[PDB]
DNA sequence: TTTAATAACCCGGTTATTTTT
DNA sequence: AAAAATAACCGGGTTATTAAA
């Protein structure tokens, strides 16, 4: 009884599309024209108050020719034993089943000859096979299809809901209450929800994501959702850059609005993880067709029980994202001396030798969407705008000046930064994580 | 020059309001009718196409009487320097400025005889003194106020912008870009902004915040706000749209408290309640803004101990000293806890956990004016006065003899496991206790 | 013979004490 | 007589080795 797919041929934006469905469907995307045409395709198939006006000239493909519109719904009916809705659809259809063991049923909408009397005319045919479809019998204004289904449309009998953007002029907690009410109540068994707000999509289970695109053909991507608050604003994006901390984010929001400031309208997003852990995020983004991009920094860690033996932490966190094996450990000797500045200067010079030692493995990290820095953000930020960093802080060592307060000295660099400097950050050879987010 | 105040007297919701407002005014609250009526009071004061129809019967306070509606605006006139609006405002007037050393200017709005042929007969007067105001002169349909000020209204010469709900049919990143165009650049200098959106208040500085109260007296709280302001305003921007705010340190007591405030009072966000994450024990960054806007700043803390850097065995008293730093008082002295080297771990944790009760029952006089104000201090942490409420049900779920040791290892991963299997009576058990009296003051019961 | 309990590191904050110049 | 590390806690996360019953 759970709906298999819909085939739309010659409608107002479509040429040949086959959108897989189930119950509880969510439609999003960039263009609103394809989302309105998807819900009006369901309204022309299953609602009589749109279907009684017929088709206009604008309801065909573009505005002229290809004068044969099919909208076909395929239900995947099968045997659900004594069921409330399935035995109802056995009971009203009756004689249009060609066999008693058929596990599929078709509802087809045909339209032809727009050019004669300026009128579309819509013919609805039942049938469990693609050949020998039987016409739906009706006496007056009422078909026998209208005894089965009922369509309720929301915009600011098996019941189908069609909801278009309920986030307009409501509070966000009312969107959270609508988000729980769409998935715990059994009266919202079948819907098609069009939305932009992330608060309607916090809790979500067993849901076909239908993504429409900005192309003129409009192709649709259809994905199953089975089982989070950070991912809800990243559900509406195709490309997600996964970054570690807020100091990365303030720099990237200053660069990405001074180079290409409409990146999130095109479908890019900046996602925080709050640490160095990406494997809980990339399995969620991989199942939903969202292209993750990972930016992380190379780190070293001292080993417990051994003095001088250091383990390769930032390399192994990219090897565990690929399912690979860990590396063997290194040995650094460090004297007593002072451990404030000089110990960090030994540990930078070891990590550069590591980063040139495993450069062909950095290459197969970068063949996937994992980008690993040489040391940190603050040291390859110094490799681009290091002539501009000494003027702002009035200091000889600006990396050590950012090392004291990582975010508070970052926002003083952000608040005094020129327009040409963001191109120098963005066009660097080591800031290539940004170039895969914008898609250029 | 800058705006100084408006005084609205007998208009359609107000009885006597003296609203002190600077430039770049931001208007918010749960009274959308009062925000709409405040912008209509500015349109009857300063716009031509609203004032040419006059007052109807509906904007005579409630529906009747109130026979003298006075709307008086003061702009105080004394900045000059490179801004020529002082020179325009003193060049258009002739005899309203009687003395050239005066530092106040009055634009007054009057109306009378409300029951004569259903017309307001709006009269506009100028003057630098409150007594003997002169009449604003005009020839035909155009006053002398009309040649000075121009009003542009947005709803989906000296320029005044009146913007009403711009988040309708506007995308979220363009709301953030509209906040950046409102407050960083100098394009809009005089505006009044009404909104319901948290993302128009991210980048804001040097602005007057007007909070409209939910009561029927429609009084307002106006705050001069000057300032990492992104890290402050990202948390604070959804908290300003809330009348009462609970300040919590961690995401364990968002997951714990949102289950309880959906089982007991699930419409608590619709009456002016909010839960504010801090991410640590730093509440002095957040209480400076909420107290000046009339928002109650409710705070739940835990007692903490720290070993000192130089001496061994003595303990800095960080549980009470973070609560006195909001109250500005002098810090406490030092205590001595004798812990040997071969005790470390669970025994060391319970040996410090006894001494956090021993410092708390000693200092019950000191915590009386903590809880008399909106600062709440726990016994040890969240998970022992949570065990003093639902502790028979803590041992049911984890299949553990001592579940508070089982919960400190995990934090969120067994806090979520606790919150998913909570019964209905359990969320009234935890809401009722006197150590969870911070939850009552958020909802007022 | 498994099993929890810290060393080590990452993403943010504070406040008093050495420390070095 | 300062100002810059450095303990030592607070809100979150992951491996890996050790002590531990
Ligand atoms: Ca890093
Ligand atoms: Ca705590």
Q: Give the separation between CA B235 and CA B274, rounded to whole angstroms.
A: 11
Nearest nucleotide (C1') to alpha carbon of B277:
D11
CATH architecture of the domain with range A5-225: 3-Layer(aba) Sandwich (3.40)
Q: Which residues of A touch B29 (CB under 8 A)?
A: none
- C-beta of residue A122 within 8 angstroms of C-beta of residue A51: yes
Please tell me what resolution, in angstroms, this structure has. Answer: 2.9
- A156 at interface of B, judged by CB pairs closer than 8 A: no
Residue A222 exposed, middle or buried by CB count within 10 Å (0-12, 13-18, 19+) = middle
Token representation of residue A121: 């005319």
Centroid of ligand 2 to alpha carbon of B301 (angstroms): 7
In this structure, the strands spanning B158-164 and B149-154 are parallel
CB contact under 8 A, B269 and A196: no
Residue A24 exposed, middle or buried by CB count within 10 Å (0-12, 13-18, 19+) = buried
Q: Give the separation between CA A438 and CA A165, rounded to whole angstroms.
A: 27
Q: Give the separation between CA B243 and CA B232, rounded to whole angstroms.
A: 18
Q: Three-class SS of residue B103?
A: coil
Token representation of residue B123: 């009269």
Centroid of ligand 2 to alpha carbon of B342 (angstroms): 26
- C-beta of residue A297 within 8 angstroms of C-beta of residue A372: yes
CB contact under 8 A, A173 and B231: no
Q: What is the sign of the dihedral through the CA atoms of B346, B352, B356 and B362?
A: positive
- C-beta of residue A96 within 8 angstroms of C-beta of residue A134: yes
Q: Give the separation between CA A70 and CA A124, rounded to whole angstroms.
A: 10
Question: How big is the CA angle at B185 (ends A272 and A438), to the nearest 5 degrees?
Answer: 35
Nearest to B269 among A173, A196, A261 (CB): A173
Greatest Cα pair distance in chain B: 96
Looking at A59-159, list the stretches that DSSP marks H as alpha helix, in order from N- to C-terminal side. Answer: 86-93
Q: Give the separation between CA B283 and CA B376, rounded to whole angstroms.
A: 12
Q: Which residues of B touch A172 (CB under 8 A)?
A: 198, 238
In this structure, the strands spanning B5-8 and B17-20 are antiparallel
From B239, B279, B286, B208, select the one nearest B24 (Cα to Cα). B208
A416 touches strand D (CB under 7 A): no
Query: Where does chain B break, by residue before each gap (C–N > 2.5 Å)?
Result: 156, 227
Asked if CATH classification 3.20.20.450 holds for the domain at B5-229, the reply, yes or no, is: no
Enumerate the nucleotides of strand C whose atoms come under 7 Å of any protein CB.
Answer: 4-18, 20
Q: Which residue is nearest to nucleotide C13 (CA to C1')?
A: B280
Phi, psi of A419 (to 5 degrees): -75, -30
From A165, A169, A197, A265, select the one nearest B195 (Cα to Cα). A169
- Those of residues 176-195 in B touching chain A at CB distance below 8 A are 177
Centroid of ligand 2 to alpha carbon of A157 (angstroms): 54
CB contact under 8 A, B177 and A246: no
Nearest nucleotide (C1') to alpha carbon of B314:
D8
Q: Give the separation between CA B426 and CA B234, rounded to whole angstroms.
A: 33
Nearest nucleotide (C1') to alpha carbon of B346:
C5
Residue ranges of the domains in chain A?
Answer: 5-225, 239-438
Token representation of residue A376: 């940190």
Which residues have C-beta under 5 Å from ligand 2, the single-atom ion?
Answer: B 302
CB contact under 8 A, B171 and A246: no
Q: Give the separation between CA A222 and CA A49, rounded to whole angstroms.
A: 29
Q: How are strands ordered across the β-sheet holding A134-135? A: A17-20, A5-8, A68-74, A106-112, A122-127, A134-135
Q: Three-class SS of residue B35?
A: helix
- For B229, the closest chain A residue by CA position comes to A411
């Amino acid at each position: 009884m759970k709906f298999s797919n819909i085939t739309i041929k010659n409608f107002r934006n479509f040429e040949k599309v086959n959108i897989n469905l189930d119950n509880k469907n969510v439609i999003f995307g960039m263009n609103d024209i394809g989302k309105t045409n998807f819900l009006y395709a369901l309204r022309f198939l299953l609602d009589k108050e749109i279907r009684k006006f017929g088709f206009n000239k604008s309801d065909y493909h573009k505005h002229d020719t290809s004068k044969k519109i099919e909208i076909i719904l395929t239900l995947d009916l099968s045997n659900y034993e004594k069921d409330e809705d399935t035995k109802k659809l056995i009971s009203v259809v009756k004689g249009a089943r060609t066999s008693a063991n058929a596990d599929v049923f078709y509802i087809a909408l045909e339209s032809k000859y727009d050019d004669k009397e300026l009128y579309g005319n819509i013919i609805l045919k039942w049938g469990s096979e693609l050949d020998n479809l039987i016409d739906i019998p009706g006496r007056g204004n009422i078909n026998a299809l209208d005894n089965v289904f009922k369509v309720i449309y929301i915009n600011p009998k098996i019941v189908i809901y069609l909801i278009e953007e309920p986030e307009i002029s409501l509070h966000r907690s009312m969107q959270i209450a609508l988000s729980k009410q769409l998935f715990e109540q059994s009266t919202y068994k079948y819907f098609f929800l069009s939305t932009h707000s992330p608060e309607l999509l916090y809790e979500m289970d067993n849901t076909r994501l239908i993504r429409v695109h900005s192309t003129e053909k409009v192709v649709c991507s259809s994905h199953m959702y089975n089982v989070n608050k950070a991912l809800s604003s990243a559900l509406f994006a195709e490309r997600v850059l996964l970054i570690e901390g807020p100091s990365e984010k303030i720099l990237f929001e200053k660069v990405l609005d001074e180079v290409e400031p409409e990146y999130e309208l095109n479908g890019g997003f900046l996602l925080e993880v709050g640490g160095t852990y990406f494997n809980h995020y990339v399995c969620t983004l991989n199942d939903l067709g969202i292209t993750h991009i990972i930016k992380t920094d190379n780190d070293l860690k001292s080993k417990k029980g051994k003095k001088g033996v250091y383990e390769l932490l930032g390399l192994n966190r990219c090897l565990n994202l690929l399912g690979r094996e860990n590396l063997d450990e290194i040995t650094i000797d460090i004297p007593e001396d002072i451990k404030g500045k000089k110990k960090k200067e030994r540990l930078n010079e070891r990590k550069k030798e590591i980063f040139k030692q495993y450069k062909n493995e950095v290459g197969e990290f970068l063949g996937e969407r994992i980008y690993l820095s040489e040391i940190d953000l603050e040291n390859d930020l110094y490799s681009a705008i290091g002539e501009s960093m000494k003027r702002i802080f009035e200091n000889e060592d600006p990396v050590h000046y950012l090392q004291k307060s990582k975010l508070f000295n970052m926002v003083e660099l952000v608040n005094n930064l020129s327009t040409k400097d963001c191109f120098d950050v963005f066009e660097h050879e080591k800031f290539a994580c940004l170039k895969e987010l914008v898609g250029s």
